[PDB]
Amino acid sequence: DQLTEEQIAEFKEAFSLFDKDGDGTITTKQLGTVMRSLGQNPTEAELQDMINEVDADGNGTIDFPQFLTMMARKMKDTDSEEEIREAFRVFDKDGNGYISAAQLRHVMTNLGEKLTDEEVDEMIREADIDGDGQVNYEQFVQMMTAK
Amino acid sequence: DQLTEEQIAEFKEAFSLFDKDGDGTITTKQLGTVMRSLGQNPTEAELQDMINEVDADGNGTIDFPQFLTMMARKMKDTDSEEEIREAFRVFDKDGNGYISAAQLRHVMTNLGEKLTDEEVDEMIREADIDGDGQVNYEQFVQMMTAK
Amino acid sequence: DQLTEEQIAEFKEAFSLFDKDGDGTITTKQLGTVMRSLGQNPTEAELQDMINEVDADGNGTIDFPQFLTMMARKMKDTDSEEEIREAFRVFDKDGNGYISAAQLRHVMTNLGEKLTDEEVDEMIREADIDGDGQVNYEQFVQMMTAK
Amino acid sequence: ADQLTEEQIAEFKEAFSLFDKDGDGTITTKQLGTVMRSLGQNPTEAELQDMINEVDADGNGTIDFPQFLTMMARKMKDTDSEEEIREAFRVFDKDGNGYISAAQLRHVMTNLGEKLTDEEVDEMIREADIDGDGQVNYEQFVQMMTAK
Amino acid sequence: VIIQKRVRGWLARTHYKRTMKAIVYLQCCFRRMMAKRELKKLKIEARSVERYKKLHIGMENKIMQLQRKVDEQNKDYKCLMEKLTNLEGVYNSETEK
Amino acid sequence: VERYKKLHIGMENKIMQLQRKVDEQNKDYKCLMEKLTNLEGVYNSETEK
């Protein structure tokens, strides 16, 4: 299909900004970064799938028409915050919405992809609650709904 | 709030000088410049909103009471230079504030408000920015704060 | 029954008003106007009863003690506009809730107290009462709301 | 709208400076009433105390030209015609002819509404040039007032 | 893994918003510096009060309009909480019944 | 005329406070517009249900 013109312009500025050489090419790491930074939720498996499709296109770099096609692919996806909130509620051992934050960091390092120590600590002090003290992941779900 | 008489003389001087003739009614294009004459930064969105509000009077004519509204509306928001330093150094991946002049030029070209590369080069010469060496953030911050 | 200071202040203000001489002894004819403009809803028979009480008191002139006593006996009266609306409706021959101003004048003046024609016109005036057309009952509702 | 011409505001400023011997611009309650009447439109005593409270909001009851601006702006919405006032004086006359004694007018202005000072009574009696015994139209004085 | 996806999305969105805020600050402050040095260059002998003298009456008129608009906004606010109280009371009574 | 000029300067000073008051009144106006709309919608839905 065809996207909104304002959306196309926003994709253009994102492409220009995340490109550091100014040529108009995006690497796999920059591809994952822009997928995560557009707003939609990219799956790690789906991130590798998109990388593989780019490799099928070739050259290991993203041109603007390819960028628009992958924008169409990305908008074809949808994100639901109620489902991730329910998954978080199941994730908590108590299930009341309050869970130990240090245990959270340890599990997301173990289960799922290992979050980097920088990302882990950034999450820690953005949560604004002590690691030993109970934290509410529902607050994180709400701040995802806000964006 | 309350402001000194010397600054009042400063606005009166600014209004006198920005008038190429003596009749008054400096063009609305110089409008924003007049506001920047006060060492204050009105954003382009705020600039166009202010222009739209002025257009009710129309004719592209500015008046001293309208300039007082200009300065008060800008005074509604206040900013510090440390936030500007943090904004400059957060774009850099290293975080030391050292970025290549090509990176800064690309940042300028990627702006929503299009900035001429001629002005970027002029600022580079003003700050003696080196293209090959990463420019220290404090080097430009010195006359950022001097303003 | 003793009212508040502001009540007696307003009462004495009206007292000084209708006292064209300021003597303090006002005849019955002007006392009736005082009573009606003060805020009361007195029956003409009740007015004449008050006149008989004054004559028993003597001289046919009112004093502020007697005035306050008959206040105390008069504030107990209260009327609801629904009863007056029903009175107008039963005055109306068709019973649809609309009576001609000429018909209303004739019905009110032929029986009861012979109210003068000038004050009937004053009824027609200041209330947007249509002389030939049927009188709106909402006009009368507003007139009694203003009392 | 109805933007005031430079001459009018300049003359009002001159009168304000003239009345205040100090020249500092400070306005007192008596000065408030003086400028209030110098504006020339109808001033209200309840509005007088309201604006006195507004001045007290600043404190000390001492204020300058911006208070004058506030009062003139609040009074601009008020519009009155002297013909309307002179036709509304008919309700004063029970007879309605308009030829009435000045004694009853004196009694009313002394007692009705806000009490008026005795010196004010004497001033009005002297200025009206109307004999108490003779019933004389108040409209004769309303005309010379309409001159202002 | 879904938690990982959400965390990456949030991280990158926050970085993105920080980048736009930084870029806006940088461009606006660059414009401020350039206009400031333009003004410094444009410094000349002195001013003329007579220009302010004519504009004083305009400021008078705008002040008049200021108190006016204050008054109409106040009246609108009066009607506003009147309507607010009416709706609150009516709907509260209806809901309770 | 010196007091004249000094009071003109004070008048020029006064403008900003008035403008600030206008802006704050506008903010309150829009805020309670929003409050009115939200309350009306919630009450309507509750009454209907």
Walk me through this protein's architecture.
- This is part of a larger assembly, with 4 copies of chain A and 2 copies of chain E.
- Chain A is mainly alpha-helical and 147 residues long.
- Chain A is 64% helix and 4% strand.
- In chain A, strands 1-2 form a two-stranded antiparallel ribbon.
- Chain E has 97 residues and is mainly α.
- In chain E, 91% of the residues lie in helices and 0% in strands.
- Chain E is built from 2 helices and no strands.
- The relative contact order of chain E is 0.04.
- Chains in contact: A-B, A-E, B-E, B-F, C-D, D-E, D-F, E-F.
- At the B-E interface, helix 1, helix 2, helix 4, helix 5 and helix 7 of B face helix 1 and helix 2 of E.
Largest chain-chain contact? B-E, 47 and 35 residues
Instruction: Determine Rg of chain E (CA atoms, Å).
Output: 27 Å
Relative helix content of chain E: over 70%
Helix count of chain E?
A: 2
| Total helical elements of chain A | 8
Strand % of chain E is under 5%
Distance between the ends of chain A? 25 Å
Category from helices, strands and their pairing of chain E: mainly alpha
Order of helices and strands of chain A: HHHHHEHHEH
Counting DSSP E segments of at least 2 residues, the number of strands of chain E comes to: 0
Distance between the termini of chain E: 50 Å
> Strand order of the main beta sheet of chain A, please?
1-2
* Oligomeric assembly: part of a larger assembly
Structural class of chain A: mainly alpha
PDB class: motor protein
Keywords: intracellular trafficking, molecular motor, myosin, autoinhibition, motor protein
Entry title: Cryo-EM structure of full-length Myosin Va in the autoinhibited state
Chains A, B, C, D: Calmodulin-1
